[PDB]
Symmetry: D2
Subunit: 323 residues, 4 copies
Amino acid sequence: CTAITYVSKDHYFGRNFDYEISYNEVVTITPRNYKFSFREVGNLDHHFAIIGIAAGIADYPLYYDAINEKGLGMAGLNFSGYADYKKIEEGKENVSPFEFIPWVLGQCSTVDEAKKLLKNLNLVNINFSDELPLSPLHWLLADKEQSIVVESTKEGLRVFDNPVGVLTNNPTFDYQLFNLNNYRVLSTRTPKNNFSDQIELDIYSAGMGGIGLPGDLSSVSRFVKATFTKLNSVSRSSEYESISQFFHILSSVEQQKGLCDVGDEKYEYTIYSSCCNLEKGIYYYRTYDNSQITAVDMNKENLEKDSLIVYPMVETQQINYAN
Amino acid sequence: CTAITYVSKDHYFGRNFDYEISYNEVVTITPRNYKFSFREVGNLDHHFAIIGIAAGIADYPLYYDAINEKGLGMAGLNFSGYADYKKIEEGKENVSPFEFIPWVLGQCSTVDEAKKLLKNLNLVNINFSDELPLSPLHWLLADKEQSIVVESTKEGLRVFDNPVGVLTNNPTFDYQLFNLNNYRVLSTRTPKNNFSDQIELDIYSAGMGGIGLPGDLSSVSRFVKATFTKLNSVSRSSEYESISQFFHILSSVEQQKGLCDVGDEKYEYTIYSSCCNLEKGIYYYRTYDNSQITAVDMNKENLEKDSLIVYPMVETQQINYAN
Amino acid sequence: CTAITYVSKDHYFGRNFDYEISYNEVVTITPRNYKFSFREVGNLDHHFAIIGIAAGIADYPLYYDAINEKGLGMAGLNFSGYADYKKIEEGKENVSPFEFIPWVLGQCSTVDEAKKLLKNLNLVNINFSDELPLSPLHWLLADKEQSIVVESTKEGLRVFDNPVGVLTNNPTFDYQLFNLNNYRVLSTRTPKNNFSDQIELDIYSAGMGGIGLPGDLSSVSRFVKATFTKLNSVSRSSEYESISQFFHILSSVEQQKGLCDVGDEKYEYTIYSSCCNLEKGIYYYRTYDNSQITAVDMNKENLEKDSLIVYPMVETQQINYAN
Amino acid sequence: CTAITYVSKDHYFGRNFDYEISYNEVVTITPRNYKFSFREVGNLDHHFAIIGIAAGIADYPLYYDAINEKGLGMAGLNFSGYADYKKIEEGKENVSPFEFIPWVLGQCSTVDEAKKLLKNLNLVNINFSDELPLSPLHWLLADKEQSIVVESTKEGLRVFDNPVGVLTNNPTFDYQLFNLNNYRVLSTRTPKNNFSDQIELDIYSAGMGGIGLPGDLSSVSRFVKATFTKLNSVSRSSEYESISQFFHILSSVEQQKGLCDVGDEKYEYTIYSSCCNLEKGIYYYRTYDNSQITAVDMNKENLEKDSLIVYPMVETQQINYAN
């Protein structure tokens, strides 16, 4: 997985969802009066409306990522072997990872509010059900001001400011930031010949400033390439050019089927790619097999409802036959 | 630019067109009775039908790439500083680079026929017009059997067999093939710990087999990554899954706006990406700002016409609004 | 700096000392009755004998590295910006970095004894003198069983087990170990063509298993290359062959004059390279301008003395003129 | 193998000899009146004196490398699979590779003279003897003005000017020079943060300008690292300091035993390293298990003799026991 934020007049938030198998992903709008029952903290009978992509395997919104009607985004990304969930601890707000996106997005309008809510968080090892055990995750949260990373590991709970608005998988966020130090020299412009003034070295290609940028599908490499591509991106401000650039950034680090074998020719690939406009409450997405951008606008629904609104995903290529 | 061939059940050919500006790109079908007048060789009054993307600046099909009705594809890719075009040479078929795609695709049904035709070729330095001087190019040709590369350089004209079905920009094709030797170790699977059996190294990410793959936008790096991604692609045999995979291969080496500065913030970027089905005569394309695949089917036209059939390219985002 | 341990039959310990200027580096034997006065802990009037290279100040053995007569080695390596030394803390053994090598090597026969001693350590910010402020350092300690790394940073004091027996400069040791995970594929043997079974890739060179190994002079790169070179080294048990291999490992990551400019053509270079036999108490060294190995054997001195025994370093080329 | 030139005040020439097994390598001075009998060209009964290292299994000087009394150096380096030797060709100077160093160094005082002599050369496939078939080689020649590379391949005989004064093994020299283009950015100084002006990236190590420099033992990697290390080496004030720097350049790309397995634990390693002072006719050398520099001075011999003067190499560690 790769999650990013991007600014181009509006502020966008979204992710590549990378896994082996598609589990009936749907776009789900949770309206304001859909009751959230939490196992160990107080219920939210009335809360902010949410739109995101969820696993369509329950009548509870099991979100992989989502934004709320106040412009706050949150995404859970695989963090296998690094994530550690805890026992219920007295004095803490004990929240299960499966409840965590509803818990935050339900009641926070900004990342600063999320920071205050997270001060007493303890992420607890309680499964949604026996049939559906917890995934090992870490989280990116973002609004129009800033983004943060939340990591619950064996040593504890850390909330990091994210100066680049990017997150992938393992290892911890502090290693990911540190590793960018190694790429300081990379550039969008042709470098000078610093190697030796005694010989002539030919600029035989454009793009030589970026040589050294890693192009493989591993977690650290995608973090570096997504960061360089996001930070150096240029768009145009209009919505369509803006989301175009966003999906180009995500394309840069997507995983193609066949290239990442996780054992026995079982391939990890980018099942979908999302781009959310935080100001307008629009969830846009592509899928591996549908290149066309599909848009679901949360504000076109009756957000005073109390039942989940589900949009099944367009998963076949939608071709414009021009003749 | 990056050009590739790919086989699933059908055979596909296409390219990323990477440059600073659009020369009014259009999809042009050249029907059979559109007369080709050649400056220094014999005319083709009747020939194979062709479909490709061209610069729409004249009532000649100035193709960047195309396929013909017999399943032969050809593409010209930037080769700046390496390309050399010649004086008229007696006893040769003297063909200008601007005429070259029409010359080959007009009269050859296969790459083997193209190989025979190319034995007598001399590419001459004749401009289409004063307003349109020649670009420095090299060419990939492909059919369902094989692909070749044509390069006219200062040392002469070389025709290479292309064992990977990929081409980018500079340098010469022999260096490009040779450089793949350096990447023999790359894998789709997790490597064994060969570094030392004395220590335990953790597989902290999937995709570690590919570490070493270059991710920058330079010509050689894109050649290596496109080759690795193409050769290790899997898809099912269906048309939509096949072209999905094809566009994913091209996405892997596309150039995002902002990332390749050739100047004072003059950006090289992937203006369009094409995929042609050689068996069906369908030209499919995406553009930088339209993620939806658009399809133009040469066989839906009256190929006995004698004038160019020109379709505008759909260049703005075609979004499916789901609510 | 790079410090390593290496086993043949005997156990060896040593380092490259990398800096801009050579001062009065000398080989100094501290005999058992040389009284160690400590600024905040109890004095050691009688202790283990030590041999190492020091800065050549009459009043005290200011060691860069050393071993003791019981086969325990310790080295201080530059750790600029990462090292943090503390205020005196009650209930701790408050030891200055300049006292640290004498403090450990004076009273510990093994790394296990050092581990117990270090449980109470607080490294305090007390200069040897006003004219000679503390350097920012971290430490490698080794005996014939194991090695550890000691790091005092802003977060606190950490003692790590060192599974590879290597240390360089910044960042923290945990990041250095983690980064080795990225090099699991590297091999002494020619890799298989894993890139694609569809094409023939030529083994045009020996040594291709190691491609990916970094060759620059930076701290992390030297850590990776020293580790790979040390762990894959082979040598016979005989002393001359063993220290030969050791100096070859150190040569692999040495810094050549001209290549590492730390500002206005001020060059960091490997001033000396040491190899200590822990079992035999011999300090062997080469210097940048003397390739011949020099040996100083601590057991040839009167270790019951109470005064420092100082040997100048042989700093100019000792050439065998053979004809 | 790696061969280099380096200038300090004097001009130096030398090489690492990398192979699996040491035979009877000897330092051999060929005096002026040792008759050179050539199988297919005119004999040189009187010629320039030569000193180099040879295979001491024959009464003829079978040099791996050498310099002559007029300051011209020549070295043969493994070129396996690339070297091609020819049939005797009428009108050419037909010289066997085993005769080639004597042929050039016998009669040329400069590289310019060698260039004229090489205009008619045809390197022929004639073994010295049945017990000793020809090795596949290419050659570096150097004097105080310049250096060249000689490569006889299937396509023919090519003499290149060598702008960097380095040579390794495969592939052809043109590819080796071209590949340097990929390293234009590398520097001896800390790079600017070109990655992004939006974030602060920490200079946590010196030597970061060189990141990207390859550190493995393959032929291309050693070519790049030797070139960068040689070109950015300082010059020095004395003979001793100068050859110290020279051996440091060679050390940078030496092959350590255990790291390069060409077989079933058959290790390629740097058996000897040479440094020749072209002005003084001194052959200096350091073997793998003798770190001390040994010097053999051609001018201390009677160069009017007619028989080879052969010195065994000092192959065991010469240690300075200082106490």
